Ligand SMILES: CC(C)CCC[C@@H](C)[C@H]1CC[C@H]2[C@@H]3CC=C4C[C@@H](O)CC[C@]4(C)[C@H]3CC[C@]12C
Ligand SMILES: CC(C)CCC[C@@H](C)[C@H]1CC[C@H]2[C@@H]3CC=C4C[C@@H](O)CC[C@]4(C)[C@H]3CC[C@]12C
Ligand SMILES: CC(C)CCC[C@@H](C)[C@H]1CC[C@H]2[C@@H]3CC=C4C[C@@H](O)CC[C@]4(C)[C@H]3CC[C@]12C
């Protein structure tokens with residue numbers, strides 16, 4: 072469904088697909104993903120501020136998960152996303168096809184680190200860049 | 204966990220010592236339980252009995268050390284009477300744990316119980332040496348000579 | 364400023380690690396120092412009101428005697444023993460036990476405790492040397508930053 | 509001329525290896541020696557123009573005190589304390605802190621640094637003994653040639 | 654040792670001693686204490702029993718899995734399997 | 750990017766080569782290969798005994 | 809990387825990444841509390 | 857002598873200015889490995905000689921070679937910086 076927030080409306084279809092992978096896995100009994108999201112004490116955009124329908128129906132969006140993983144790393148980790156490159160106006164750029172598949176790979180990578188699936192993690196780590 | 208008496212906040216030397224010295228100011232606030240029940244729980248903890256035994260033995264060492272350093276009077280002094288009551292209490296505790304808790308063989312097996320017997324024995328010889336003739340100068344010097352041996356043992360009972 | 368050096372920096376990290384062994388040595392010595400000090404001060408000076416000088420004497424002589432400075436001439440003067448042999452022909456027979464107490468004491472302090480400190484330092488160094496090198500390598504970037 | 513011997517030669521090579529640990533000990537001691545020396549010389553002699561004698565006193569007494577020669581009788585004479593107890597009845601109350609500074613100092617030098625030197629030498633010897641034997645065996649041909 | 658030691662410290666332990674003598678006198682002549690304690694419910698006992706049995710089975714499965722993955726054991730299994738393989742070939746030739 | 754990707758592929762090939770050359774791994778591979786060898790012999794005899802029933806008893 | 813070309817590996821470790829807050833890999837490694845990565849000779853050579 | 861000379865040439869070539877470069881890495885590694893192997897052969901044959909006849913092995917180590925500047929094998933070994941060869945008991949026995 073359409074949302075009044077411009078950051079969540081800017082997201083691409085595949086971002087909603089990862090949100091679906093988090094959502095389907097989260098509905099299982101005693102899943103640590105739900106417990107992690109609930110104990111995180113963050114809003115819809117992942118900011119540490121602790122309406123309800125948007126905060127529960129779209130609780131597993133990629134921006135909020137990015138914020139949760141950023142807090143897991145250190146106190147000043149801030150992963151920068153740029154979804155503006157997935158618009159059709161940037162198709163003429165030569166190297167964009169690598170950029171578009173690397174960034175994408177990365178978020179899927181993060182999902183695979185969350186659910187603890189090493190083989191899938193290794194595959195998405197291999198597809199993207201910035202390996203070390 | 205058994206040492207600390209099923210508590211999670213009072214779990215260090217300073218915390219239990221601070222709570223022990225100020226019972227009504229740290230116990231209500233720092234409540235863990237993993238008012239009357241908490242008071243009955245903290246002071247029955249084995250660690251609390253150790254800190255009570257530790258403080259008691261430390262005062263005994265300081266008071267006995269002061270007594271042997273300061274000059275003896277011509278009659279039995281007040282501090283001497285306090286030490287007499289303290290070592291009888293220690294002697295009765297050693298006899299009760301011998302005759303009525305483990306057994307005589309079990310008691311004498313332990314090296315610290317033997318040291319306890321040596322302490323009580325050294326104090327009573329020195330006291331009776333002084334108390335036989337309190338105005339005698341020679342009795343005071345010998346008594347302090349036996350009580351020199353008595354102080355080293357008290358400071359080793361801190362090793363325990 | 365020595366933390367930057369590849370020789371002095373890890374050693375500084377190990378010095379901070381050995382400080383617990385130093386604390387262990389201090390807690391064990393404190394026992395023998397106060398026990399021997401109270402006993403020795405009482406034997407040397409019976410019949411004296413307690414004062415601040417009594418407390419200094421208990422802390423003063425026992426502490427330096429563990430570094431090899433033995434005040435035996437000074438203890439002979441304080442004991443009022445007039446004999447050619449150092450602890451004979453004294454006014455009180457009890458003060459002749461002061462060299463015996465002292466012997467036990469330096470056996471406890473120099474022979475036993477100091478050599479155990481050497482043993483604890485050798486064991487502690489072998490245990491935490493590699494961790495100190497790794498921690499120094501993290502601190503190399505910290506100092507650079 | 510001892511390099512030819514199968515016992516003395518490798519030990520000479522290890523002595524040259526331990527010299528870096530000796531340098532480490534010297535750099536750490538230098539810190540405590542100059543700090544304690546400036547502090548102790550100032551407390552013993554306040555109100556004196558700076559001269560060459562001030563500099564000798566700072567270097568002179570702190571260095572020998574680490575080998576067990578404690579100049580406590582001499583420091584008692586310089587402090588102008590007239591009491592039977594060594595650091596009582598002094599003209600200035602500040603000079604009574606000189607034995608305290610000294611205690612810390614010898615705790616730093618004898619108890620901590622000397623025993624760490626023993627630990628570094630044991631570790632260094634075990635590490636470079638086999639390399640020293642191999643290097644001595646190459647030097648055996650060098651000396652023969 | 655410090656579970657069984659009285660709380661009261663040494664100068665004041667005499668009070669604890671006369672209190673224990675008072676308890677012995679009250680117990681040997683008209684006992685009314687009864688040494689009451691607390692007993693765990695059957696629900697929590699069966700919970701502890703279930704946990705211990707489940708973890709016993711888990712450790713035995715894990716232990717069996719660990720011994721079959723040791724090298725020495727693996728080499729023994731290949732060896733008896735190879736000897737059985739020659740035996741199977743000998744009976745095969747016989748049939749041939 | 751090209752250097753890092755190339756060295757990532759090189760380390761993974763080298764790492765895979767290193768794990769297959771460990772002794773423990775080699776012993777496991779001989780063991781599953783031997784069990785598969787007995788399995789192959791059991792199906793072979795079955796074919797041998799089937800062939801014996803099929804032909805020798807038919808005459 | 810350090811085995812193949814030490815200078816280019818050094819150039820790689822100094823590279824600022826757009827995805828995170830322009831942090832190089834050594835800053836990332838410190839933030840990830842990787843003692844093994846920081847104690848490596850290649851990383852130490854770049855820090856020196 | 858040839859094994860010692862070979863070990864020295866491969867170790868010096870592996871760290872030479874002419875073998876640095878991204879494509880030569882595996883090659884460099886291979887040379888160090890081969891260098892070590894040649895060192896092992898020089899030690900090994902020497903050991904075998906000392907095992908068979910110690911006096912004749914000693915005679916062998918003292919032999920002047922026409923191919924190089926009349927240098928024996930110990931001089932060659934020192935020039936090849938072979939610490940393993942010089943620390944061997946046979947070589948040390950001849951030096952003594
Ligand atoms: C195991 C240890 C604690 C035993 C201690 C024994 C002590 C308490 C006893 C044993 C022998 C005793 C000494 C025997 C004789 C004399 C001479 C007399 O003119 C003064 C007292 C003096 C010097 C005694 C002092 C106390 C003494 C040292
Ligand atoms: C600690 C245990 C094992 C041993 C104790 C030994 C004690 C009791 C012994 C050792 C040396 C002894 C002293 C040796 C000589 C003299 C001189 C004499 O004119 C009076 C007694 C006196 C002063 C002795 C007192 C007791 C003494 C201190
Ligand atoms: C190998 C080691 C442990 C040997 C031990 C030596 C002991 C037994 C020696 C060394 C110094 C000695 C003391 C030196 C001087 C005196 C003063 C004299 O008036 C009585 C004996 C007394 C108190 C001696 C008792 C015995 C003594 C303590």
Ligand SMILES: CC(C)CCC[C@@H](C)[C@H]1CC[C@H]2[C@@H]3CC=C4C[C@@H](O)CC[C@]4(C)[C@H]3CC[C@]12C
Nearest residue numbers: 595596600601602603604605606607608609612
């Ligand atoms: C280093 C930290 C941890 C502890 C510092 C302790 C210092 C401040 C203490 C320890 C012993 C103290 C001295 C002990 C006694 C006297 C004598 C008195 O007439 C004047 C003060 C004076 C001279 C004290 C000055 C302060 C002193 C030096």
Ligand SMILES: CC(C)CCC[C@@H](C)[C@H]1CC[C@H]2[C@@H]3CC=C4C[C@@H](O)CC[C@]4(C)[C@H]3CC[C@]12C
Nearest residue numbers: 389392393419422423426595596604607608611
């Ligand atoms: C186990 C070890 C660490 C015990 C340490 C002992 C310390 C606390 C003792 C040993 C020597 C002592 C000093 C000896 C003499 C004097 C001079 C006097 O006028 C003031 C106190 C002062 C300055 C003492 C302060 C306390 C002191 C430093």
